[PDB]
Amino acid sequence: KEDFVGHQVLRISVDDEAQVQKVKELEDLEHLQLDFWRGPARPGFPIDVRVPFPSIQAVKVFLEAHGIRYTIMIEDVQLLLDEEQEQMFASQGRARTTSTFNYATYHTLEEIYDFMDILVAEHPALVSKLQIGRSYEGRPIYVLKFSTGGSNRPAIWIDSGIHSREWITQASGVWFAKKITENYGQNSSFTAILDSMDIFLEIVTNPNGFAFTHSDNRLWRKTRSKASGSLCVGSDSNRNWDAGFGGAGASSSPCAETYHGKYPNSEVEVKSITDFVKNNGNIKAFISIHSYSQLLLYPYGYKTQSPADKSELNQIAKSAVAALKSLYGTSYKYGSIITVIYQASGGVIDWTYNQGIKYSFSFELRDTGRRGFLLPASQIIPTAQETWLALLTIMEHTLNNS
Ligand SMILES: CC(C)[C@H](N)C(=O)O
Ligand SMILES: [Zn+2]
């Protein structure tokens, strides 16, 4: 285990471009071992960073010397860890059925893989468990297929957990998979979707990573491929695609949290998807799910030039986000990745959209920074529930607009 005792997470404000440029100088001070939750982009866009205990003075002094304002969002990250660990301990249950699974606690890799096998066994005629590959540490990579028949019917892909530290995404992916086998046949509207389409749902899209955030390092985001030449492990799975690969927004340093890999599709966990998509070919909408920041995003990340379907994408996004907000009030923003979060090269949806999958969306779930990746387990179900309203609006649109 790594501990995060007295590590703080700072929210840095930048009022102009010169300040934005200073924060990305600090980002270049490798030996600070700074973990940027939400990196430098533009003035008025919030920069979140986790700084390790030793580095805190160095960061604070640099910031004040330049008159850049910061605030402390989380005064000690290890306390949030202790709270999480504490409630998984108390929630440690025994799911032999999906109706008795605890959806309101975080689970381990095994417990989720167990869940998939209990789900396909309870509803064999709807869900299937497809293995599309094996990760670097040899773990199988699974996809659930939800289908009422057909041969190569138009499908809808959802993935979750491409970045392992984002535990709200794998947890919501598990709630959705119960949800579909619940509302099929009982929800007139949702029943019409599955009568026409297939849904592919990949819950643990980065299994080696996910297990590592339970074993050794909670705050781990990359894969676990061990690379030629370094003490340094992993590549950022959402910098590894061949869309703007190696462009601005991805690091060439293997020790960086945003290191792209040696070549596009070098990671098994990504190349499995690329082969799945390129062999399926009738995938109509592609949704990749992250956290945090409460954003719904569409192409592009790597480039300022607009996607050709911009007006439509912006309207779906407008409708979806409004459906999400109608439940719990949770405020989202939307728009193209590069304008709404930052420029970042080699993303999933920039690739899929360039493969003709027009309805390519990326979510960033709750929250907007007070817990970040350590989102309280009591929010797992509200988060899944409201994002299902948005995920439905996109599915309905796919159905309608053939
Ligand atoms: C680029 C963006 C789509 C994503 N949150 C990333 O940082 O990997
Ligand atoms: Zn992510």
Coordinates of all heavy atoms in Angstrom, one line a residue, residues 11-78:
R11 N -7.1 23.6 -5.0 CA -7.7 24.1 -6.2 C -7.1 25.4 -6.6 O -7.2 26.4 -5.8 CB -9.3 24.2 -6.1 CG -9.9 25.1 -7.3 CD -11.4 24.9 -7.5 NE -11.6 23.5 -7.9 CZ -12.8 22.9 -8.0 NH1 -13.9 23.6 -7.7 NH2 -12.8 21.7 -8.5
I12 N -6.5 25.4 -7.7 CA -5.8 26.6 -8.2 C -6.7 27.4 -9.2 O -7.3 26.8 -10.1 CB -4.5 26.1 -8.8 CG1 -3.6 25.4 -7.8 CG2 -3.7 27.3 -9.3 CD1 -2.4 24.7 -8.5
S13 N -6.8 28.7 -8.9 CA -7.4 29.6 -9.8 C -6.3 30.3 -10.6 O -5.3 30.8 -10.1 CB -8.3 30.7 -9.0 OG -9.2 30.1 -8.2
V14 N -6.7 30.6 -11.9 CA -5.9 31.4 -12.8 C -6.7 32.4 -13.5 O -7.8 32.2 -14.0 CB -5.3 30.4 -13.8 CG1 -4.0 29.8 -13.3 CG2 -6.4 29.3 -14.2
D15 N -6.3 33.7 -13.4 CA -7.1 34.8 -13.9 C -6.7 35.2 -15.3 O -7.4 35.8 -16.0 CB -6.9 36.1 -13.1 CG -7.3 35.9 -11.6 OD1 -8.1 35.0 -11.3 OD2 -6.9 36.8 -10.8
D16 N -5.5 34.8 -15.8 CA -5.1 35.1 -17.1 C -4.1 34.1 -17.6 O -3.9 33.1 -16.9 CB -4.4 36.5 -17.2 CG -3.3 36.6 -16.2 OD1 -2.3 35.8 -16.4 OD2 -3.3 37.4 -15.2
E17 N -3.6 34.3 -18.8 CA -2.9 33.3 -19.5 C -1.5 33.1 -18.9 O -1.0 32.0 -19.0 CB -2.7 33.6 -21.0 CG -3.2 32.5 -21.9 CD -4.2 33.1 -22.9 OE1 -3.8 33.6 -24.0 OE2 -5.4 33.0 -22.5
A18 N -1.0 34.2 -18.3 CA 0.4 34.1 -17.7 C 0.4 33.2 -16.5 O 1.3 32.4 -16.3 CB 1.0 35.4 -17.3
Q19 N -0.8 33.2 -15.8 CA -0.9 32.4 -14.6 C -1.0 30.9 -15.1 O -0.5 30.0 -14.4 CB -2.1 32.8 -13.7 CG -1.9 34.2 -13.2 CD -2.8 34.5 -12.0 OE1 -3.8 33.9 -11.9 NE2 -2.4 35.5 -11.2
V20 N -1.8 30.7 -16.2 CA -2.0 29.4 -16.7 C -0.6 28.8 -17.1 O -0.3 27.6 -16.7 CB -2.9 29.4 -17.9 CG1 -2.9 28.1 -18.6 CG2 -4.3 30.0 -17.5
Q21 N 0.2 29.6 -17.6 CA 1.5 29.2 -18.0 C 2.5 28.9 -16.8 O 3.3 28.0 -16.9 CB 2.2 30.1 -19.0 CG 1.7 29.7 -20.4 CD 2.6 28.6 -21.0 OE1 2.8 27.5 -20.4 NE2 3.1 28.9 -22.2
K22 N 2.2 29.6 -15.7 CA 3.1 29.3 -14.6 C 2.7 27.9 -14.0 O 3.5 27.1 -13.6 CB 2.8 30.4 -13.5 CG 3.7 31.6 -13.6 CD 5.1 31.1 -13.4 CE 6.1 32.0 -14.1 NZ 5.3 32.7 -15.2
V23 N 1.4 27.7 -13.9 CA 1.0 26.3 -13.3 C 1.4 25.2 -14.2 O 1.9 24.1 -13.7 CB -0.6 26.3 -13.1 CG1 -1.0 24.9 -12.5 CG2 -1.0 27.4 -12.1
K24 N 1.5 25.4 -15.5 CA 2.1 24.3 -16.2 C 3.6 24.3 -16.2 O 4.2 23.3 -16.5 CB 1.5 24.1 -17.6 CG 1.5 25.3 -18.5 CD 0.9 25.0 -19.8 CE -0.6 24.9 -19.8 NZ -1.1 24.8 -21.2
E25 N 4.2 25.3 -15.6 CA 5.6 25.1 -15.3 C 5.8 24.2 -14.1 O 6.7 23.4 -14.1 CB 6.3 26.4 -14.9 CG 6.4 27.5 -16.1 CD 7.2 28.6 -15.6 OE1 8.0 28.5 -14.6 OE2 7.0 29.8 -16.2
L26 N 5.0 24.4 -13.1 CA 5.1 23.6 -11.8 C 4.8 22.2 -12.2 O 5.3 21.2 -11.6 CB 3.9 24.1 -11.0 CG 3.7 23.6 -9.6 CD1 4.9 24.1 -8.7 CD2 2.3 24.1 -9.0
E27 N 4.0 22.0 -13.2 CA 3.6 20.6 -13.6 C 4.9 19.9 -14.1 O 4.9 18.7 -14.2 CB 2.6 20.7 -14.8 CG 1.9 19.4 -15.1 CD 0.9 19.6 -16.2 OE1 0.8 20.7 -16.8 OE2 0.2 18.6 -16.5
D28 N 5.9 20.7 -14.5 CA 7.2 20.1 -15.1 C 8.2 19.8 -14.0 O 9.3 19.4 -14.3 CB 7.9 21.1 -16.1 CG 7.2 21.1 -17.4 OD1 6.3 20.3 -17.7 OD2 7.5 22.0 -18.3
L29 N 7.8 20.0 -12.8 CA 8.8 19.7 -11.6 C 8.5 18.4 -11.0 O 7.6 18.2 -10.2 CB 8.4 20.8 -10.6 CG 9.1 22.2 -10.8 CD1 9.1 22.8 -12.2 CD2 8.6 23.3 -9.8
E30 N 9.0 17.5 -11.8 CA 8.8 16.0 -11.7 C 8.9 15.5 -10.3 O 8.1 14.6 -9.9 CB 9.6 15.2 -12.8 CG 9.0 13.8 -12.9 CD 9.6 13.0 -14.1 OE1 10.7 13.4 -14.6 OE2 8.9 12.1 -14.6
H31 N 10.0 16.0 -9.7 CA 10.4 15.5 -8.4 C 9.4 16.1 -7.3 O 9.6 15.9 -6.1 CB 11.8 16.0 -8.1 CG 12.9 15.0 -8.6 ND1 12.7 13.9 -9.3 CD2 14.3 15.1 -8.3 CE1 13.9 13.2 -9.6 NE2 14.9 14.0 -9.0
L32 N 8.3 16.9 -7.8 CA 7.3 17.3 -6.8 C 6.4 16.1 -6.6 O 5.6 16.2 -5.7 CB 6.6 18.5 -7.3 CG 7.4 19.8 -7.1 CD1 6.5 21.0 -7.6 CD2 7.8 19.9 -5.6
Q33 N 6.3 15.3 -7.6 CA 5.4 14.1 -7.8 C 3.9 14.6 -7.6 O 3.1 14.0 -6.9 CB 5.7 13.1 -6.7 CG 7.0 12.4 -7.0 CD 7.2 11.2 -6.0 OE1 6.7 10.1 -6.4 NE2 7.7 11.5 -4.9
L34 N 3.6 15.6 -8.3 CA 2.2 16.3 -8.3 C 1.3 15.5 -9.2 O 1.7 15.0 -10.2 CB 2.4 17.7 -8.8 CG 2.5 18.8 -7.7 CD1 3.0 18.3 -6.4 CD2 3.2 20.0 -8.3
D35 N 0.1 15.3 -8.7 CA -0.9 14.4 -9.4 C -2.1 15.3 -9.8 O -2.9 15.7 -8.9 CB -1.4 13.4 -8.3 CG -2.6 12.6 -8.8 OD1 -2.7 12.4 -10.0 OD2 -3.3 12.1 -8.0
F36 N -2.1 15.6 -11.0 CA -3.1 16.6 -11.4 C -4.4 15.9 -11.7 O -4.5 15.2 -12.8 CB -2.7 17.5 -12.6 CG -1.8 18.7 -12.3 CD1 -0.4 18.6 -12.3 CD2 -2.4 19.9 -12.0 CE1 0.4 19.7 -11.9 CE2 -1.6 21.0 -11.6 CZ -0.3 20.9 -11.6
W37 N -5.3 16.2 -10.8 CA -6.7 15.7 -10.9 C -7.4 16.4 -12.1 O -8.0 15.7 -13.0 CB -7.5 15.9 -9.6 CG -7.1 14.9 -8.5 CD1 -6.0 14.1 -8.5 CD2 -7.8 14.6 -7.3 NE1 -6.0 13.3 -7.4 CE2 -7.0 13.6 -6.7 CE3 -9.0 15.1 -6.8 CZ2 -7.4 13.1 -5.5 CZ3 -9.4 14.5 -5.7 CH2 -8.6 13.5 -5.0
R38 N -7.2 17.7 -12.2 CA -7.8 18.4 -13.4 C -6.8 19.5 -13.8 O -6.5 20.4 -13.0 CB -9.0 19.1 -12.9 CG -10.0 19.2 -14.1 CD -11.2 20.1 -13.8 NE -11.3 20.9 -15.0 CZ -12.5 21.4 -15.4 NH1 -13.6 21.3 -14.7 NH2 -12.5 22.3 -16.4
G39 N -6.0 19.2 -14.9 CA -4.9 20.1 -15.3 C -5.2 21.5 -15.8 O -6.3 21.8 -16.1
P40 N -4.2 22.3 -16.0 CA -4.2 23.6 -16.6 C -4.8 23.6 -18.0 O -4.3 23.0 -18.8 CB -2.7 23.9 -16.8 CG -2.0 23.0 -15.8 CD -2.8 21.8 -15.8
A41 N -5.8 24.5 -18.1 CA -6.4 24.7 -19.5 C -6.5 26.2 -19.9 O -5.9 26.7 -20.9 CB -7.8 24.1 -19.5
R42 N -7.3 26.9 -19.2 CA -7.7 28.3 -19.4 C -8.0 29.1 -18.1 O -8.4 28.5 -17.2 CB -9.0 28.4 -20.2 CG -8.9 27.7 -21.6 CD -10.2 27.7 -22.4 NE -10.2 26.6 -23.2 CZ -9.6 26.4 -24.4 NH1 -8.9 27.4 -24.9 NH2 -10.0 25.4 -25.2
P43 N -8.0 30.4 -18.3 CA -8.3 31.3 -17.1 C -9.8 30.9 -16.8 O -10.6 30.9 -17.6 CB -8.3 32.7 -17.7 CG -7.3 32.6 -18.9 CD -7.4 31.2 -19.4
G44 N -10.0 30.8 -15.5 CA -11.4 30.7 -15.0 C -11.9 29.3 -15.0 O -12.8 28.9 -14.3
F45 N -11.0 28.4 -15.6 CA -11.2 26.9 -15.4 C -10.3 26.4 -14.3 O -9.2 26.7 -14.1 CB -10.7 26.2 -16.7 CG -11.6 26.3 -17.9 CD1 -12.1 27.5 -18.3 CD2 -11.9 25.2 -18.6 CE1 -13.0 27.6 -19.4 CE2 -12.7 25.2 -19.7 CZ -13.2 26.4 -20.1
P46 N -11.0 25.6 -13.4 CA -10.4 25.2 -12.1 C -9.4 24.1 -12.3 O -9.6 23.2 -13.0 CB -11.5 24.8 -11.2 CG -12.7 24.5 -12.1 CD -12.4 25.3 -13.4
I47 N -8.2 24.3 -11.6 CA -7.1 23.3 -11.7 C -7.0 22.7 -10.4 O -6.8 23.3 -9.4 CB -5.8 24.1 -12.0 CG1 -5.9 24.9 -13.3 CG2 -4.6 23.1 -11.9 CD1 -4.7 25.9 -13.4
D48 N -7.3 21.4 -10.4 CA -7.2 20.6 -9.2 C -5.9 19.8 -9.1 O -5.6 19.0 -10.1 CB -8.5 19.7 -9.0 CG -9.7 20.5 -8.9 OD1 -9.6 21.7 -8.6 OD2 -10.8 19.9 -9.1
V49 N -5.2 19.8 -8.0 CA -4.0 19.0 -8.0 C -3.8 18.4 -6.6 O -4.0 19.1 -5.6 CB -2.8 19.8 -8.4 CG1 -2.7 21.1 -7.5 CG2 -1.5 19.0 -8.4
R50 N -3.4 17.1 -6.6 CA -3.1 16.5 -5.3 C -1.6 16.6 -5.1 O -0.8 16.2 -6.0 CB -3.4 15.0 -5.4 CG -2.9 14.2 -4.2 CD -2.9 12.7 -4.5 NE -1.6 12.2 -4.3 CZ -1.0 11.4 -5.1 NH1 -1.6 10.8 -6.1 NH2 0.2 11.0 -4.7
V51 N -1.2 17.2 -4.0 CA 0.3 17.4 -3.8 C 0.7 16.5 -2.5 O 0.0 16.6 -1.5 CB 0.7 18.8 -3.6 CG1 -0.4 19.8 -4.3 CG2 0.9 19.3 -2.2
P52 N 1.7 15.7 -2.7 CA 2.2 14.9 -1.6 C 2.8 15.8 -0.5 O 3.3 16.8 -0.7 CB 3.2 14.0 -2.2 CG 3.0 14.1 -3.7 CD 2.4 15.5 -3.9
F53 N 2.6 15.3 0.8 CA 3.0 15.9 2.0 C 4.3 16.7 1.9 O 4.3 17.9 2.2 CB 3.0 14.9 3.2 CG 3.5 15.5 4.5 CD1 2.6 16.4 5.1 CD2 4.7 15.2 5.0 CE1 3.1 17.1 6.3 CE2 5.1 15.8 6.2 CZ 4.3 16.8 6.8
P54 N 5.4 16.0 1.4 CA 6.7 16.7 1.4 C 6.6 18.0 0.5 O 7.6 18.8 0.6 CB 7.7 15.7 0.9 CG 6.8 14.6 0.3 CD 5.6 14.6 1.1
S55 N 5.8 18.0 -0.5 CA 5.9 18.9 -1.6 C 5.1 20.2 -1.3 O 5.1 21.1 -2.2 CB 5.4 18.3 -3.0 OG 6.1 17.1 -3.2
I56 N 4.3 20.1 -0.3 CA 3.3 21.1 -0.1 C 3.9 22.5 0.1 O 3.3 23.5 -0.5 CB 2.5 20.8 1.2 CG1 1.5 19.6 1.0 CG2 1.7 22.0 1.8 CD1 0.9 19.1 2.3
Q57 N 5.0 22.7 0.7 CA 5.6 24.0 0.9 C 6.1 24.5 -0.4 O 6.0 25.7 -0.7 CB 6.8 24.1 1.9 CG 6.3 24.7 3.3 CD 5.5 23.7 4.0 OE1 5.8 22.5 3.8 NE2 4.6 24.1 4.9
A58 N 6.7 23.6 -1.2 CA 7.3 24.0 -2.4 C 6.2 24.5 -3.3 O 6.5 25.5 -4.0 CB 8.0 22.8 -3.0
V59 N 5.1 23.8 -3.3 CA 4.0 24.3 -4.2 C 3.4 25.6 -3.7 O 3.1 26.5 -4.5 CB 2.9 23.2 -4.3 CG1 1.7 23.8 -5.2 CG2 3.3 21.9 -4.8
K60 N 3.2 25.7 -2.4 CA 2.5 26.9 -1.9 C 3.4 28.2 -2.1 O 2.8 29.3 -2.3 CB 2.2 26.7 -0.4 CG 0.9 25.9 -0.3 CD 0.5 25.5 1.2 CE -0.8 24.7 1.2 NZ -1.1 24.4 2.7
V61 N 4.7 28.0 -2.0 CA 5.6 29.1 -2.1 C 5.7 29.6 -3.5 O 5.6 30.8 -3.8 CB 7.0 28.7 -1.6 CG1 8.0 29.9 -1.8 CG2 7.0 28.3 -0.1
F62 N 5.8 28.6 -4.4 CA 5.8 28.9 -5.9 C 4.5 29.7 -6.2 O 4.6 30.8 -6.8 CB 5.8 27.6 -6.6 CG 5.7 27.8 -8.1 CD1 6.8 27.9 -8.9 CD2 4.5 27.8 -8.8 CE1 6.7 28.0 -10.3 CE2 4.4 28.0 -10.2 CZ 5.5 28.1 -10.9
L63 N 3.4 29.3 -5.6 CA 2.1 29.9 -6.0 C 2.1 31.3 -5.5 O 1.7 32.2 -6.3 CB 0.9 29.1 -5.4 CG 0.2 28.2 -6.4 CD1 0.9 27.9 -7.8 CD2 -0.3 26.9 -5.7
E64 N 2.4 31.5 -4.2 CA 2.3 32.8 -3.7 C 3.3 33.8 -4.4 O 3.0 34.9 -4.6 CB 2.5 32.8 -2.2 CG 1.2 32.3 -1.6 CD 1.5 31.7 -0.2 OE1 2.7 31.9 0.3 OE2 0.5 31.2 0.5
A65 N 4.5 33.3 -4.7 CA 5.5 34.1 -5.4 C 5.1 34.6 -6.7 O 5.6 35.6 -7.3 CB 6.9 33.3 -5.6
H66 N 4.1 34.0 -7.2 CA 3.6 34.5 -8.5 C 2.2 35.1 -8.4 O 1.6 35.5 -9.3 CB 3.6 33.3 -9.5 CG 5.0 32.8 -9.8 ND1 5.6 31.9 -8.9 CD2 5.8 33.1 -10.8 CE1 6.9 31.6 -9.5 NE2 7.0 32.4 -10.7
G67 N 1.7 35.1 -7.2 CA 0.4 35.7 -6.9 C -0.7 34.9 -7.5 O -1.8 35.5 -7.7
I68 N -0.6 33.7 -7.5 CA -1.7 32.8 -8.0 C -2.4 32.2 -6.7 O -1.8 31.7 -5.8 CB -1.1 31.6 -8.8 CG1 -0.3 32.1 -10.1 CG2 -2.1 30.4 -9.1 CD1 0.6 31.0 -10.6
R69 N -3.7 32.4 -6.8 CA -4.5 32.0 -5.7 C -4.9 30.5 -5.8 O -5.2 29.9 -6.8 CB -5.8 32.8 -5.8 CG -5.6 34.3 -5.4 CD -5.8 34.4 -3.9 NE -6.6 35.6 -3.8 CZ -7.8 35.6 -3.2 NH1 -8.1 34.5 -2.6 NH2 -8.6 36.6 -3.3
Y70 N -5.0 29.8 -4.6 CA -5.3 28.4 -4.4 C -6.1 28.3 -3.2 O -6.1 29.2 -2.3 CB -4.0 27.5 -4.4 CG -3.2 27.8 -3.1 CD1 -3.4 27.0 -2.0 CD2 -2.2 28.8 -3.1 CE1 -2.7 27.2 -0.8 CE2 -1.6 29.1 -1.9 CZ -1.8 28.3 -0.8 OH -1.2 28.6 0.4
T71 N -6.9 27.3 -3.1 CA -7.7 27.0 -1.9 C -7.6 25.5 -1.6 O -7.2 24.7 -2.5 CB -9.2 27.3 -2.0 OG1 -9.6 27.2 -0.7 CG2 -9.9 26.4 -3.0
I72 N -7.7 25.1 -0.3 CA -7.5 23.7 -0.1 C -8.9 23.1 -0.1 O -9.8 23.5 0.7 CB -6.8 23.4 1.3 CG1 -5.4 24.1 1.3 CG2 -6.8 21.9 1.6 CD1 -4.8 24.0 2.7
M73 N -9.1 22.1 -0.9 CA -10.4 21.4 -1.1 C -10.4 20.2 -0.1 O -11.4 20.0 0.5 CB -10.6 20.8 -2.5 CG -10.6 21.9 -3.5 SD -12.0 21.9 -4.6 CE -12.7 23.3 -3.6
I74 N -9.3 19.5 -0.1 CA -9.2 18.3 0.8 C -8.0 18.4 1.6 O -6.9 18.5 1.0 CB -9.2 17.0 -0.1 CG1 -10.4 17.0 -1.0 CG2 -9.1 15.8 0.8 CD1 -10.3 15.8 -2.0
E75 N -8.1 18.6 2.9 CA -6.9 18.9 3.8 C -6.1 17.6 4.1 O -4.9 17.7 4.3 CB -7.4 19.6 5.1 CG -6.2 20.4 5.8 CD -6.5 20.7 7.2 OE1 -6.4 19.7 8.0 OE2 -6.9 21.8 7.6
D76 N -6.8 16.5 3.9 CA -6.0 15.3 4.1 C -6.7 14.2 3.3 O -7.8 13.8 3.6 CB -5.9 15.0 5.6 CG -4.8 13.9 5.9 OD1 -4.5 13.1 5.0 OD2 -4.3 13.9 7.0
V77 N -6.1 13.7 2.3 CA -6.7 12.7 1.4 C -6.8 11.3 2.1 O -7.7 10.5 1.8 CB -5.9 12.6 0.1 CG1 -6.4 11.4 -0.7 CG2 -5.9 13.9 -0.7
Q78 N -5.9 11.0 3.0 CA -6.0 9.8 3.7 C -7.2 9.6 4.6 O -7.7 8.5 4.7 CB -4.6 9.5 4.5 CG -4.6 8.3 5.3 CD -4.5 7.1 4.3 OE1 -3.8 7.1 3.4 NE2 -5.4 6.1 4.6

